Design a protein around this nucleic acid. Sequence first.
RNA 1: UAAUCUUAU
RNA 2: AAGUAAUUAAUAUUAGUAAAACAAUAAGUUAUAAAUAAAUAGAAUAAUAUAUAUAUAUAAAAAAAUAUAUAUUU
RNA 3: AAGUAACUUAAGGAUAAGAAAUCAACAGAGAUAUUAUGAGUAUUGGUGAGAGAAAAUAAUAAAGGUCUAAUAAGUAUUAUGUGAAAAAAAUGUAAGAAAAUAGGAUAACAAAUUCUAAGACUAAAUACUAUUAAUAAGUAUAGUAAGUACCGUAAGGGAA
Lengths: 185, 49, 74, 104
Amino acid sequence: RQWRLIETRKIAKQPNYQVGDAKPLHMPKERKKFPDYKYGESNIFKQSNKGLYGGSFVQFGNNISESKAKTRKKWLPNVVKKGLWSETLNRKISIKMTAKVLKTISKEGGIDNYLTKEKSARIKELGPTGWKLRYRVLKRKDEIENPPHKRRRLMSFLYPLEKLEYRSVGKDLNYKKFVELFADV
Amino acid sequence: PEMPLTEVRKSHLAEKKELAEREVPKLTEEDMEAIGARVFEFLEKQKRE
Amino acid sequence: SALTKRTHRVKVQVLKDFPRFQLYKGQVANVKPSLMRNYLHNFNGAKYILSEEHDINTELLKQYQTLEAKLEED
Amino acid sequence: YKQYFDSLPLKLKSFFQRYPPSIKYSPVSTSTKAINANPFLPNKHPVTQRFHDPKYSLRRMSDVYKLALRYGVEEFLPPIENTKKLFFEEKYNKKTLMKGVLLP
RNA sequence: UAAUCUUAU
RNA sequence: AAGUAAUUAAUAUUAGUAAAACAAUAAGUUAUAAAUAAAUAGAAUAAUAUAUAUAUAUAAAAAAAUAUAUAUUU
RNA sequence: AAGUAACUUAAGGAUAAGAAAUCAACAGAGAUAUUAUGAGUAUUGGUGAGAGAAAAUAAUAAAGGUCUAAUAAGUAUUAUGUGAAAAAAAUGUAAGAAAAUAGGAUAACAAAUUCUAAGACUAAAUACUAUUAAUAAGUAUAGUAAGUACCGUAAGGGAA
């Protein structure tokens, strides 16, 4: 097979922003939660952006009679709503799937496994939703593997002292501001 | 935020690192000379015939 | 297909009692894929086992075997 | 000699640079991690146990071999025994005629 | 009937 | 304000070239053999069709058609 | 007619293609692209209208090969409904492999041969715009105003 309707897609190349450079005119309010999906978000069978369609877009072709009188028809995939169990998330995740995709999931032995397969083909035939799910699972796995220590209290201890010092000079100091200051330190 | 690397990807990376760590095959001056001499001999033989 | 339905199985390990489906905790069974995805796999109730070495739980399986032996005796 | 070597075609020169003749590369398929792994053969990766495709894909390998033949630098290239390709006079001589040719 | 599945809170 | 342009093919006339031409690195096109659905067949074994060539046919002929031979090749 | 107009979406200075599971044929060649030739030829078609390659040979063209992948399965294939007039690759539904001891390619088969899918990157030759420069058996109705006056509720039209 091929992933033509996926890998044809192109997204505007964001310029790498240096810390000292000037701002863009429209900077967003809330930050980027998820990683950027290489292949954007489908602009044709937008039905499939909400689910795990397995790179199965709608076809259009011809109904043909005994007289060979051609008439345009479309061929939809066998989509199905299906709440499937994630071991990593410890909850079942309900989404639209192609019956094919459900079969693949069953073969691979789980939904998390399906999401996390490292092949490029899989990545292509994950949606934007599928990509987000993958990210959620992978991040959770990483957390499970590696808890922070294998600092917050120190910051909390120092904060009031820092505030007092600021006041003695003359200025007031908030927590949030303190946190912002001492993130990289 | 960058997506984390899955187990297979990590293993591949480790393998690549191990490969890099080994001594790299590089074409020595001596090897080039040996080749060049052989080429010359071949040319001489061609000229003769 | 009907043939497919008959012959398609999925090797799982149950991690929970399942009285309706006749599957006792720790048992390693070749179940129907539909059954696995719908009933067994939910709430960490069972687990898919592709690689028998890495995936499978050993102690649970041993316990199941012991239970089966006890049943046979009785 | 050095000047003559330099005068060799580009692809051949590049090959010699990146797989030099000091290393006696294997005739048979090997581990991908090995130093003597033949770039023309499909070597097996030891962990996954999957045959990697040859480092030089078959066309490129053939071109390299033809270049070597032209300039008489065959034996410095690693062996093409277990790659099924023969070339020119050796191919002509060693081949069996088709069943259709011998037995119509 | 923990297949689907409607509704309500 | 209205038979024109581009890409082809054919015929004429002229000019160059000529059993060659075009183009010139090659490659190709056209003619240099007629044919026959097509195949591996192909034009005087003593000269004008009463010779020979191919197609039907066939032991080879004859018989239709078309084609080919009468110092210098068309 | 024609995947053309039209409508939608998205990306870049270009993009697309690109380093062979390509062709071929017992010889062999070696990414892609554009053009010529092959060739209106093979092929094809209510065997009508009509449509029509490739190999190979040259032009153009750039450093033009090169690791990025722990080597690729719900994929190869298959069945089926579709599917660039030739020439296939794709795609819905569903079945479904194998490890180079392999696999793709040819109704089929037997030989032989070739190549490595289900992972990648890639200048230049190109489209377009704008500019400068040069040439015009082009323009004074293609010579500067004007999208103005004006018509229309509007899109739109459109002078001298």
